[PDB]
Amino acid sequence: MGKRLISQNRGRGTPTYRAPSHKYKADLRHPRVDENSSLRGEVVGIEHDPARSAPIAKVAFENGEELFLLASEGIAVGNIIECGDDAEVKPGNIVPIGNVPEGFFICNVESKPNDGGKFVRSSGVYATVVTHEATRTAVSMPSGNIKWLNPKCRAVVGIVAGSGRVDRPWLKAGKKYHKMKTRAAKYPRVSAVAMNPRDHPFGGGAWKHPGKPTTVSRNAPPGRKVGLIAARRTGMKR
Template sequence: MGHRIIQQNRGRGGPTYRAPSHKYKADLKHACPNTETVKGEIVDIEHDPARHAPIARVALEGGKKVYALVTEGMGVGDEISWGPEAGVQNGNTLPLRGIPVGAYICNIEAKPNDGGKFVRSSGVQAMVVGKTTGKVAVQMPSGKQKWFHELCMATIGIVAGGGRSEKPFAKAGNKHYKMKSQAQKWPRSSGVKMNVIDHPFGGGGHQHPGRPKTVSRGTSPGRKVGHIAARRTGKWKK
């Protein structure tokens, strides 16, 4: 009997495709809701296996310690704040209505008090481009404009760790550990390189699919590879 194809194994949910969430350090939510203001001091800059950007361990005024996303220019000993009374300076987090147009921001909430959902990857930033009654327009890293509620909180600055993707892995072991932390199977082989019992495109005297690559939406799981429910096929004509 042949092996399951990758899509079937991933859907089954085995340990190979399960993210190692037991190694992650924190959810990186904002330290307070948008109605309070708290201050803290950065105690240490750490690495979190859950993300490529560095994180900061912050000691709050009451003695509680939380983790926060690091922006470029932050360091140990710096003081940062969360809340509507926080100043507009690097590393501080405040509601969008209090951030001036043209400021770079990151770690933006999708809705008020959800802790931050958007623009959290290393080296990225968004920009406040406009305001209206109850809403704030933000230009996302993709270049598209998105509207947020004015009470959604965001952090001032650019996420640290820029240029990470430009550094070569140099060794296969480095790539192995990166892919393992992201719950991705690596290395991967294309279907045409496999045996005929292991993949619908496998087998044959030379590497070729041997069958149409476009399949319907209702195809059985063992055959659902290639262009699934493609709207069109063939070369674009001018």
């Protein structure tokens, strides 16, 4: 058994690959709202989220529950966040995407209604509402894909705060090191061609090279799915 790969080590769940969950502020999700209900809350603070490197808003709701929300750009302390099917479609409000006009920017979008918000959550990203239909509503993802969602899926109106985070180059291994201390990701990473053959499919050889094509089949088993996985194509576009 030429040793297991880094991906298999991470799947094992060892401490080297686990997130420092105790360092994080909140499991960001929409407040739980019953069918045909609404809740209002006011923003009391804007805090740094170590798990995302983007601000989060602390919201005190009418029901006596205090919750951390994924902050949209422009959300300010003292703002009244409304969440409901009848809520005004305004930045920071959590409304169903069936009530959002075409061309509006949404974020923290539920995969299914009441899911808590799955898509469009990183700093600066946003989704655009494209079409409305009777049972489906379509949005353009930050990836460019068109996603057909239930119109009852809730989303906060606006874009995610923290835009331009990666415009500043790391410039230095130490800065990225400090970012990686709060993440599960292993830093730094050794290239596979630099490893021995017992440690990677690409390892070994008198000189550094994979020895086999780096595009691997989608059928390849664990310990073998390395390099370009099921690549449609390779190279820079001609």
